[PDB]
Amino acid sequence: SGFVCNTCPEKWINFQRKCYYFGKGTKQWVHARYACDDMEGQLVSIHSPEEQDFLTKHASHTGSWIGLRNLDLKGEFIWVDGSHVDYSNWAPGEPTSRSQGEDCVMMRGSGRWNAAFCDRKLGAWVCDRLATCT
């Protein structure tokens, strides 16, 4: 068993179909997106409890930016990478307990998600990309 494509860049960690990068250093949501982009990845999208568990396990104990955003003024949250929102792991009350304009999402040390202002400075951020074929 396994995945035929399972190769990851150095400093990245493979999990199933994808590779993950756990970034450190204070960034607002958009700068975080840039850091992922510059490494040819994207802010992470999450599609299963198994992925979430792997992330909770490896991710910063403080908060991390992920690639989930509300862009349409109707509070519909979508992944930056065009994937759609099947799985969710929201904290209690979230996301509707958020304020108008809180268009971004962070992942807590526990793994659960909470909407947050995009201009928050967080000390961690998670990128992913598809594992390469060899």
Residue numbers in the entry: 156 to 289
Text taken from the publication that reported this structure:
The second principal receptor for IgE, CD23, is a type II transmembrane glycoprotein with a C-type lectin-like domain (CTLD)4 (3, 4). In its membrane-bound form, CD23 consists of three CTLD “heads” connected to the membrane via a trimeric α-helical coiled-coil “stalk”. The interaction between CD23 and IgE is critical in the regulation of IgE synthesis, which can be up- or down-regulated depending on the oligomerization state of CD23 (2, 9, 10). We have determined the crystal structures of the human lectin-like head domain of CD23 in its Ca2+-free and Ca2+-bound forms, as well as the crystal structure of the Ca2+-bound head domain of CD23 in complex with a subfragment of IgE-Fc consisting of the dimer of Cϵ3 and Cϵ4 domains (Fcϵ3-4).
To verify that the principal site is indeed the location of Ca2+ binding to derCD23 in solution, and to confirm the exact nature of the interaction, several single point mutations in derCD23 were generated: conserved residues were mutated within the principal (E249A and D270A) and auxiliary (S252A and D258A) calcium-binding sites, along with the highly conserved Asn-269 residue (N269A and N269D). As expected, the two principal binding site derCD23 mutants, E249A and D270A, were unable to bind Ca2+. D258A (auxiliary) and D270A (principal site) crystallized differently, and in all eight and seven molecules within the asymmetric unit, respectively, Pro-250 is trans. The crystal structures of the derCD23 principal and auxiliary Ca2+-binding site mutants were determined (but not those of N269A or N269D mutants). No major conformational changes were observed in either the principal or auxiliary Ca2+-binding sites upon introduction of the point mutations that could inadvertently affect the binding of Ca2+, with the exception of D258A.
